[PDB]
């Protein structure tokens with residue numbers, strides 16, 4: 002028996018008063034689908050003759066192992082965005098412009114403008130502190146081999162007249178010179194000095210100098226003749242003094258050299274030697290001595306003779322004479 | 334023919350001894366599903382009258398293009414986590430606190446504590462090396478316009494008596510002064526000096542000074558009168574010396590000024606002029622000269638006369654007399 | 666009626682000339698599937714007796730909420746890769762090696778090699794600028810408590826003879842000494858000085874010094890005896906001069922001390938005192954005075970007497986005599 006089932010197009014079914022008997026098959030001609038009547042329900046309400054429940058499907062895809070927008074969105078949210086952040090490269094890029102503690106080269110300038118915790122007294126302060134007590138090198142090497150410059154190598158300046166610290170303080174202990182300035186015979190000489198001092202302060206010596214030499218001078222000066230011409234330097238001196246007036250001045254009465262022992266001293270106050278042998282000096286009591294014949298354009302006020310090698314005085318002479326003339330005058 | 338098929342609830346089927354003939358339809362009344370008998374298999378083992386194989390489904394979703402947890406987990410694992418890493422901002426945030434080689438402003442302090450490779454002799458060492466041979470600016474500018482300070486602008490100090498380098502070494506070549514200290518007439522003057530030196534070392538001159546001037550003094554001093562009062566500075570001197578004792582001392586015998594030519598010299602050893610004209614001097618042989626009448630509170634030991642303008646000596650006089658008295662005595 | 670349907674294996678169906686009548690069921694015996702004839706289409710072209718359209722499935726999975734490779738790939742592309750970027754740690758790791766503006770410790774060296782915008786005149790230049798006008802601390806503290814060192818604490822050097830700036834310039838205003846060097850009595854003394862100057866320049870005083878003291882010397886020297894032995898320092902001097910020759914020299918003619926008032930001065934040019942009381946001096950007109958008896962190994966050229974306390978001259982004496990002898994000669 003070739004059995005054929007009630008049938009019409011889906012849309013036609015979709016509007017049939019036709020109640021399929023229970024378990025009677027009806028057929029959707031334009032789709033080929035079928036449905037079994039429940040004895041009591043319009044065709045468009047019967048379900049299919051076979052399941053359509055995803056659960057019952059063979060060859061299910063693993064949907065479970067697939068990532069979900071949300072899951073993937075949170076997992077992304079923990080991770081940093083390309084620009085919010087610097088490539089290892091831009092990091093170096095910037096880093097290499099910064100000086101390191103271990104050392105570097107400043108092509109630019111290093112201004113310092115200190116806040117001053119305590120300003121740290123005595124050698125654990127100063128904007129630059131340099132402790133070399135465990136190192137064999139220099140503290141601050143500053144040099145130039147330029148031909149001309151517009152400024153000096155180191156300059157110190159204080160602008161307020163109340164300022165009360167030194168510009169340079171040198172507290173030195175060691176076996177060589179505390180401070181050494183050496184100028185080298187130029188090919189080109191100059192008219193300036195190695196150390197030049199200028200003080201406007203009428204209330205304080207431009208340079209003050211104290212020492213406690215056993216066998217040496219507090220200030221020692223040596224003039225080397227710059228040439229081999231013994232007669233070359235006829236005009237150099239070991240020490241030159243000029244007492245002078247204020248530009249636009251009446252004059253000056255300031256003294257030349259002024260020596261003194263406030264404390265008192267047995268030494269020669271002025272001792273002058275040549276070829277390491279005394280030639281003139283002033284004894285501490287103010288007597289003077291000279292190896293060689295002298296001259297006074299002028300007169301010598303002095304005490305009458307007593308010794309034979311004492312100079313005569315008009316008085317002594319006259320009196321010697323006055324005596325002879327008179328004593329002679331057995332011519333009574 | 335309205336055909337209806339064997340039928341009972343699924344659960345009822347699920348336990349029927351009823352073997353459906355091959356290709357005979359049976360019907361699950363509570364689900365509407367059907368199944369075809371294979372002539373030999375309990376109903377609950379027949380499959381459906383139509384496929385449920387995901388593969389055969391129309392409107393398949395692209396499951397293939399969906400990301401998978403694993404895939405998405407590895408791809409995430411290559412990407413960096415928000416905090417493990419610094420925002421471009423925190424990067425600057427930190428970076429801007431670091432001094433750069435091109436220059437910056439140190440609001441804080443810069444201690445140096447050197448390790449010392451070699452400690453680098455002669456001008457490619459020192460913790461601070463400053464080469465300005467190609468620049469027209471200063472080396473180290475240090476100034477203050479504060480009114481008071483607790484420390485100096487630069488200080489150098491060495492604490493060990495064996496220390497064997499200078500505190501400041503100045504090797505200078507150029508056309509101006511190697512070192513220049515200038516003090517400016519204060520509104521407020523002080524009692525200190527421009528350059529003050531103090532040495533405790535009894536074995537070395539506090540300041541030693543050598544030069545080879547052709548036509549100039551090794552040490553040159555000029556005293557300017559600070560006022561226009563010619564009689565103002567009655568008490569200044571070009572150079573003042575005080576020879577003095579140790580606080581708590583017997584005395585001192587240390588000399589005042591001590592001059593010498595160890596090598597020997599034809600020059601005036603002491604030459605004193607006024608208005609650029611000789612007034613007193615000591616000849617290199619130790620003869621002295623004076624333009625103006627002099628005085629000795631005291632006596633003058635000297636050699637008998639020879640010239641007419643030589644001073645007389647008690648002896649010479651007496652003998653001249655002794656002669657006349659005697660020669661007169663044609664009074665036989 | 667047990668109805669059974671046309672049937673053969675799928676593969677057998679798959680090649681049947683058998684046209685199923687419309688809505689007549691045929692059965693795939695090896696699969697259990699069925700199909701309804703459309704009256705006109707070979708069996709292998711009929712579809713199933715029930716849908717296989719993913720859309721119509723109950724228990725649909727949310728495919729919509731699943732992430733897609735592309736979506737997930739772009740969202741990943743915005744996020745940075747682990748190594749392209751530095752962990753907050755490596756960031757510090759590097760950062761901590763860089764000196765900060767607020768302060769740090771340079772274990773290494775800081776060379777400076779300046780480019781020079783303008784080289785900045787007068788106190789807003791120098792590779793190191795240090796302004797302490799608002800701080801109470803030091804400018805540049807450099808010290809060492811090492812025993813020996815190979816270099817100094819600060820050194821300045823200029824290599825070109827045309828160089829035209831100072832090495833150290835000190836423009837000072839304040840109430841204490843501009844520059845202070847102090848050496849402390851060593852346990853170990855040395856033979857060097859506190860300040861040593863050496864100039865090769867025959868065209869410029871090694872040290873030049875100017876000041877305008879009202880009541881003080883431009884250069885003040887004090888020699889303290891280092892011991893309490895009054896007779897200890899028999900050989901120290903306040904100032905020692907040596908005029909000397911060029912190593913390999915004929916001699917020198919350079920003078921010892923050279924004093925002058927170019928401007929002219931009423932002061933004593935040379936005044937020597939002991940226990941703060943004049944003992945010898947040279948009057949500005951070049952007359953000299955001495956408190957104590959003197960001596961000249963030699964002769965004294967001088968002007969005839971006028972006063973009684975003037976020294977006699979051979980001439981004066983002789984003439985006094987020549988007169989008496991002659992005047993006596995009432996012996997006619």
Ligand SMILES: O=C1O[C@H]([C@@H](O)CO)C(O)=C1O
Pocket residue numbers: 177178541543857861863
């Ligand atoms: O007497 C001198 O002292 C210095 C130097 O030797 C001292 O460290 C020098 O060059 C002289 O001629």
Ligand SMILES: O=C1O[C@H]([C@@H](O)CO)C(O)=C1O
Pocket residue numbers: 185186187188506824826
């Ligand atoms: O005076 C100079 O210094 C160097 C060299 O002589 C250093 O001793 C040089 O070339 C000069 O002209």
Ligand SMILES: O=C1O[C@H]([C@@H](O)CO)C(O)=C1O
Pocket residue numbers: 236237238241548549550609923925927
């Ligand atoms: O002998 C010298 O003459 C000049 C100067 O005194 C001219 O007044 C000078 O510097 C000398 O050493």
Ligand SMILES: O=C1O[C@H]([C@@H](O)CO)C(O)=C1O
Pocket residue numbers: 193197199509510873875
């Ligand atoms: O003679 C002097 O030398 C200095 C300065 O001119 C030198 O560079 C100065 O101020 C003087 O009065």
Ligand SMILES: O=C1O[C@H]([C@@H](O)CO)C(O)=C1O
Pocket residue numbers: 160162517518519520838
């Ligand atoms: O002595 C001073 O320095 C400046 C100015 O005079 C600089 O020449 C100033 O105001 C002072 O009181």
Ligand SMILES: O=C1O[C@H]([C@@H](O)CO)C(O)=C1O
Pocket residue numbers: 259261263568569570573880881882941
């Ligand atoms: O003429 C002076 O008197 C004092 C001092 O010598 C007092 O002993 C001094 O410094 C002068 O220059």
Ligand SMILES: O=C1O[C@H]([C@@H](O)CO)C(O)=C1O
Pocket residue numbers: 209211525529531841842
């Ligand atoms: O007269 C002196 O000057 C210095 C110091 O007191 C000046 O700031 C010092 O130590 C002396 O003995």
Ligand SMILES: O=C1O[C@H]([C@@H](O)CO)C(O)=C1O
Pocket residue numbers: 174492494849850851852
């Ligand atoms: O000369 C020295 O300096 C210190 C201490 O005396 C400082 O006043 C020390 O231990 C020395 O040997």
Ligand SMILES: O=C1O[C@H]([C@@H](O)CO)C(O)=C1O
Pocket residue numbers: 216217218277591593595900901902905
């Ligand atoms: O009295 C002294 O003798 C030596 C020296 O003049 C030897 O020529 C010296 O330095 C002194 O102060």
